Design a protein around this ligand. Sequence first.
Ligand SMILES: CC(=O)N[C@@H]1[C@@H](O[C@@H]2O[C@@H](C)[C@@H](O)[C@@H](O)[C@@H]2O)[C@H](O[C@@H]2O[C@H](CO)[C@H](O)[C@H](O[C@]3(C(=O)O)C[C@H](O)[C@@H](NC(C)=O)[C@H]([C@H](O)[C@H](O)CO)O3)[C@H]2O)[C@@H](CO)O[C@@H]1O
Ligand SMILES: [Cl-]
Length: 192
Amino acid sequence: NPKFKDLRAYYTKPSLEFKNEIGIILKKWTTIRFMNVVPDYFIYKIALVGKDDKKYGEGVHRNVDVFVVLEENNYNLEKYSVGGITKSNSKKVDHKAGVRITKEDNKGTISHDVSEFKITKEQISLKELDFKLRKQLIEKNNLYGNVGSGKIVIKMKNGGKYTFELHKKLQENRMADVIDGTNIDNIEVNIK
Ligand SMILES: CC(=O)N[C@@H]1[C@@H](O[C@@H]2O[C@@H](C)[C@@H](O)[C@@H](O)[C@@H]2O)[C@H](O[C@@H]2O[C@H](CO)[C@H](O)[C@H](O[C@]3(C(=O)O)C[C@H](O)[C@@H](NC(C)=O)[C@H]([C@H](O)[C@H](O)CO)O3)[C@H]2O)[C@@H](CO)O[C@@H]1O
Ligand SMILES: [Cl-]
């Protein structure tokens, strides 16, 4: 009940997608480092968390895509987002993955729904997957209305999996983890 409010608000935030941009990293001036992205005359500050800190050194980084979710921060920054950095596509991707949703309402009834998640990137961040999928589950399945727990599992063609626990926000460090979008096989969602 109480926890759903915060999650529903976060996962209904607006997002932005920047592709084929350049990232600019200057000397560390605070506790976390940032990649600056300037698509159209405003500077986006992307926190470098988890694996991204060692992945991007000072200087210019070409072929950068960013999945952006602006949010509040303790650094006094106006256009701040965490993770979501990937390598731009070498060429167009036109792929898709079936989503299988099992939901048990607050009355015990078990239902099923299906959707198709469209994949247009070779490399996709767990940030993007987690965010887009939860937003879809809120809009179409009322996630965080009556029920707000369970899991999203991204199943890969090689047998790998990536799990997002629905009762809390995706851990920040994992927002920088990236996977092969073309190798996503299907997605399983269980809400309870
Ligand atoms: C304090 C904190 O934020 N710690 C996180 C780890 O999360 C904690 O430990 C977990 C075991 C769990 O108890 C969680 O609730 C805690 O916050 C985090 O560990 C990942 O947690 C997620 C669930 O939130 C998964 O359990 C993940 O295991 C898997 C996965 O299913 O997603 C296993 C899977 O085999 C593996 N896939 C491959 C191909 O290797 C994936 C994958 O490594 C991750 O999804 C990539 O993000 O992991 C736990 O690893 C941990 C992940 O690095 O980060 C902080 O330490
Ligand atoms: Cl695995």
